[model samples]
Target: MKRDYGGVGTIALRASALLKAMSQDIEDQRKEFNQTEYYQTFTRNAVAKLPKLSRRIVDQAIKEMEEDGYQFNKKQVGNVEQYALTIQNVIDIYAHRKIPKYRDIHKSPYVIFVVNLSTVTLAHALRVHQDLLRHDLRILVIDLDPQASSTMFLETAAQAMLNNLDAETLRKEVIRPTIVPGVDVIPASIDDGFVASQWRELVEEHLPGQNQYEILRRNIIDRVADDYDFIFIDTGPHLDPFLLNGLAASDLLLTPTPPAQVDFHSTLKYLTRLPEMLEQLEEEGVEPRLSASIGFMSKKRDHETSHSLAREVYASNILDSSEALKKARTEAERFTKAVFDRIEFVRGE
Candidate 1:
């Protein structure tokens, strides 16, 4: 048996030196990324290389940037139209906004909206709610779908306050403590469908001068947001005021698509329409400003069809370079810097 106490110390020193060098390298790259002014003519293929971003989202982000006075050249090369913009511009346009933070006891929870025009939405919401129960986080599940699929999955004896879901009723009776401790729910009912059908007329008559999209946010979410660590809104497929309410209140938008052609097609269609709807909301002074939209392949049947679909999905995305890691490093550096800034601010106070 050989002893290597000095060797262990040497290894620790080497690890520390390596980490310092790596940090310095990251800082250098960050500065380089910030200073690069070389314009890139981004074709659809080029835009698709961005992590978790599709061509449709790139178009939407570019459209949003245009409205905010961001400059870019519209160019076409050999029957291919492309965006001529700097890398920084593209990154800024597509980057997810920082999460909101508060130094108070009553901070708002992270609201995630699970939406799709299919049964997969309810499945994902219920599955995720169950998964989150394993953790210590306080969770609130709100059923925005009139079908009340999630309500049935959970426990909902009394009908939800969707028919008259104001802030007062939300805090008083609508929020129900479930059998599972640390979990609460706002159940949905059939009457919600009737309410949603006349949502516009109701808004005009009762809530004058209010943005219809912000109905759930102002009335329900804001009232009970402070009590939970996370709020999951399981939305219906229909594009009504009820659905819009969930979208408006959500901080994150998640769509779970099962591995099937129909599901993929539906997800694509939904995503394409999403940008226009969010843009419309922004114009109406009811900005949703979601942190990010994430679509994940769920419920793979482990069959030949599913494998073929996976291959088809991967084949179109077989781009060169580790684009994900490069983008992640930049974002991680920014996050670290922000964390340090917050620490210093707290120290000063």
Candidate 2:
């Protein structure tokens, strides 16, 4: 059945009507949940026991959240149970853990840079985050795109990094929590272009005679290196300072490309130029940081060209966008699974 997307005026009207209707439905659901007696909630104390959390910070953040309009549920354990947070509230509580009060560094996380995208990196990263989240793994996403796609996708209105950007500033304010549990993000905004363009100048002013390209690695990534199970950096299609930093900091690089001729040509060009770029960094005395580079096809339909490209690339896992139409899974599932297996192998799991 075909749907109607009328003229701009009619579309706007439809959009407004739907938005109002959805808001009402959401309000009704919230009201129903509130009126109901049975629900799942974790006691404030129990919430503190989750990984990378402390009672001190949890209590402080929880109190602030309450003041910000989050209501805690009350019930008796057997009789007179203490105030508890809904599961969603508990997830929200962890959002405060992005810039952790305590630097409880565990083993170093496997770092993967989504160094390239075919309009699919954000979807892949988000899905992968959800998949890893279910397995009780901690993940950090650093959004490097000036577009701030991942930041917006995570439902965080704030940009990841901006002007006056420094390692200290990043630790203090840039990294924020996402809607997803067990995942934290350092979002990006339009100011990302400013940072990328002037980062070298900024670093040189403070610390002269330093290799400025390694600024991200020495300052941010190394500082919080061991804090999570995985760190995923999402990059735009630029080869500027931001991409340089991502390449400098990551352990693995993954590029997603559609099977179209233009995408393949762009991918080929990028790959061909990648070595010389790394060589430039190497001549600047920065050793190569990336251990492996992988490429996969995304948004693959039943197009013959897609198969031909896949065969040429020897890609074992082809991401079929249509598969989700029948399987009730996301478009990135196969791509995510393939990458997850690589992550496991790389981490010796």
Candidate 3:
């Protein structure tokens, strides 16, 4: 217990203290991060040692840093602490481990398209995730729903803005800034209007140097990836051009299912189908951006709700839990080894 976390605890503490003092004085972490050489030198030195450190040790060391000073307000600095840590971590990881030749990490936003089985719930879920889930994220939620539902007012007009614009223009219009902090909204809906056979055509037409199925990746994500932290796509429920495009382009898919008997089978079925399509998408000449899944939300345990009766019955009597739900949960957990995308219920309501 007397261990100082192998001195990263000390270095991380010093880094945190430096960050806190700068931010408190100027109220801007980026300005501080940019203007000062402190972070760069600190991270650079840490990164150089990354190859030498094991994952557990590196993680333990970084975690130790947060045990002390600096609660930099996210609104001002965006997620820079995590940003710094992410930069360090990714450099450590991908530098050591490269998959498919290490794609999109150079300058790209961590994109997450929030989709779901229930459109109504999915729409709200996007906001619920945006607001309540509250990560220090610069999010862009595209209302792929033609109805444009997910969220209160921002659901639609923003959707309309992107319909006839090029990427830059689209981005300028897409982000409808709000009075509410960390609000959600529409973006250039890359998930819609492109898929399957139309893929090549859209690439030829819209994307500048488009490749198979990567139209969304080329035309949308690459265009704005460096600009924000996360981009969420709200696709309509059902099999459509939007979902297909979203599936093809998304880094991960988030399906929000209500706690009901009808939902269980469908959710599992949905997750099961994604990997199933991997081969098909390849055969179809699609450059899928898909990764297993992210946070297949459900109850870990004690999933109480207004529908508690049904949930209880499913749990105890009817061999509770959907075949699809657990399988999908497994898919996501493996996909994001760190995030623990397991059944979300934390023991009852």
Candidate 4:
């Protein structure tokens, strides 16, 4: 055989080139694995598993090349492995997704009015009422109280038609829809009681039932129900005839009470006596229209006494308390539900 001394260097160089080519081919295989949906899914399935698979693939390739007397560069293997790992890491972190739900309704509108003894609670209720209107529900507020907190806020937008404002002005600005859109308010002057008292004789004359307390209910059903979704009658603290008429006319009754024991006790008296009052109305063949009564706890705190009491009340089913009234503006879901549901507490700051 001829001595092949000159060709030995060429063979060694060619061998080195072949090993480099093989390393590139291995890197290409790793790249293909990284690009595949299988690898993408697996990487996303668990972020921690990608590094183990990468290390195994890289180490196995390098070991196989080295065992064949080919010196594979560790740094080149590391660079390719790190690059592949980084691509998978980015996909894994950013791949989260979600879907939404949908629905439709038949436009049967319902109304909710907040009646409160305290001015603070009444103001909070007015704010809640405005929030409900934003959901496209029509709300009518009758401010029977002399304080006129709810009426005042709404009056800044439009003058009261129920007051001495002109009939044409009342008909156009107050009765007809105005530039500022909100609940229709029959605002209070000192004479709201007189205005309400004037209705009593008319109530007694036209009302169908013997008791004649059903007059307000008839007026609401005949004149108001077809036009509006909700009618809210705001009353003073006492159990006057006007308040009774309003309550009798309502489909739902909402009573707001502070967390104090005296308020709770007085509210309990109303609740205990309410069924009998309804019974008396029924005996006179004046079917009471109210479907439910809800107690709203306003200005609630999270101290040991309040939290413990709230928990006790809720657990006992004593009243439906609104955690929202105790806070700032309620979360959207809770606020919306409070309007429909019989009772809700809006937490105050």
Candidate 5:
């Protein structure tokens, strides 16, 4: 008999405690509510009786609050303090309220483009592209390399946009929708190499703010940004003007390098020269703008070698001695607040 009580008694005791705790929680929640459901129900019913326009406004406001990451429930009181709306939401509300005319307005989200000719960069771009596509985002893969790896992937997208008929067309359609809906691309061609040749002409015609580099920005602002949520530009391997321009215009820069000493040494040299290059732009009457750059370790089969090299370069005297490195690091820190800016690590997978 005593043994029989052990299991049943423990269960009963736990059940009793749970019920007591739950009852206390219910009581506490009740005390927390400023008004009962009865009063709230009556108020809502009264509001429903109001003019159609007034009711619509109230309903829309509630819907917006809920959509903009605000949680509202019967047990919880409405709090203006907890509710916030983004600029997009404000524009939407204004349009809904008929206070202003809003049509075909596009808001572009931040786009971080990864540029490098290496396989590591290509793999990373592909992975990130897949991730962004899942969110219904738009991505642009600018192949700075003559190899045309990024371009090749986007050729299908380009054909779709242009509606061309060629053997390259896999499906019956001219432009097959990419893995990501609403995502279009500019394919790389042999002609794309000519863009570098035209850099001088572009720079001459493109005034200070209107420089050739700004073409990419302008294209984004006008053609893509309005339509897509994000834009990514892939630069060539060489540190040419076009690449420099891309870096200058980017909100964020991702530089990919192998773990090898040669790659690290080259990266360090670029880091050292970045400041003077930026200063030269400033001297040209280009806006004294700063960009955030990160160094990414790619194709890292040996994590130890890559990580150690990265750490060593970061701590090396070149980083301290090089003005470009100092300025780049300083600017990157000002933007991201990270200990060292302009570097990252990614595996092939």
Candidate 6:
């Protein structure tokens, strides 16, 4: 009930709860026939459309991945992004599993993304799966992960248009509405060379004015955003101009972290940097400023199994660090209470 937190005492502990007030309000906001049958049909129908497109899409990324990724770091013991590349090289990620019949894409929910530890990627997939089992929210995921992990859904026709990549090609061919009906996806860049040059232009000129920031906003998200209830951009873990643009374009910013010490630590570090970035952008007069309607912190364990050894391992560390544990608890509770406090019903006849 009422207790002391040692040095900081009550005031210090109480100060942590302040986020509840500053919290942004959340307004507005699945299914089987299930997910099993959906996956079965999706897999069958989707697989037939697989193309060597993934090869071109992730080819350069993998090449660089192998050279400096976990493979180069030797964290794999014997392997690395090869794990990702192998899947890219062989199976089509989008078609690998059915996303289940969730809901319909209606509201213009622009879910912005920023991440590390790959939690957002799983969160995107998790939202789809969980909603399928829950409210059945129709979802659209934009795979911005440089690795194209999320783009694995459908087989793209990269071969047909190596020399093409414009609005027409994008609208007609690249972004596909898949078999599940509830889910649609936009794959990441085909190669690093493409984005590298684009970002150079974005960063060099995106200062405050210029059209770089709105490029994605106008061309992609604006065109398709209104059609989906939730538009999740699965961003790369790296900090870059691409992520900057996504942040500006998003309505809600959801940061999902795993139940691990490293992840939580990384999260705190990220939180520290955001205030500066948000304030800096506002001061600099960046148009359509990036401000989150909801700052959501999600704790997700990616494992499907009932028991996970890794979960236990990291959870222990988190618990042992009472400071971090307390911070996380307040964050979760703070966001919840804040959002609900601000919720105003728009009663209708």
Worst 10 residues of 1 by lDDT: 126-135
The residue-by-residue lDDT of candidate 3 on 195-231, one tens digit each, is: 3225455545654554544444554666666665556
Candidate 4: 10-residue stretch with minimal lDDT:
95-104
* Alpha-carbon deviation at 233 in model 2, angstroms: 1.7
Kindly list the per-residue Cα lDDT of model 5 for residues 1-349, writing each as its tens digit.
3775877998888987888778556656545332221121213333334333355674675587668775443433565333233323333343445542211223453445454643322322332321111223244444444454432222422222222233234223322233222434444445456656666564455434455544445433334444444345565656466565556556555555556666666666766776776675666566522345445453345544666666554443111110445685344334332212222221111
| Better candidate by TM-score, 1 or 6 | 1
lDDT of 1 by residue, 192-252 (tens): 6667788778777777877778767766667776677667787677745777777788876
C-alpha lDDT of residue 91 in model 1:
46
State the TM-score for model 5: 0.45
Ranking of all candidate structures by their TM-score, best first: 2, 1, 4, 6, 5, 3
TM values, all candidates? 0.50, 0.60, 0.44, 0.48, 0.45, 0.46
Model 3: weakest 10-residue lDDT segment is 340-349
lDDT of each: 0.55, 0.60, 0.45, 0.45, 0.43, 0.43
Clashes per candidate, residues 3 or more apart or on different chains? 0, 4, 13, 12, 9, 14
In candidate 1 the C-alpha lDDT for residue 301 amounts to: 45
Better of 2 and 4 by lDDT: 2
Model 4, 226-339: lDDT tens digits are 445555666665645556666667766665555666566665565566666667666666666675545445443332244356445444323433343335435433533553
**Candidate 6: tens digits of C-alpha lDDT, residues 270-320:** 756766655544654665434443332344343222124334422421111
Please tell me which predicted candidate would have the highest TM-score against the true structure: 2
Q: Residue 147 in candidate 6 has what lDDT?
A: 60
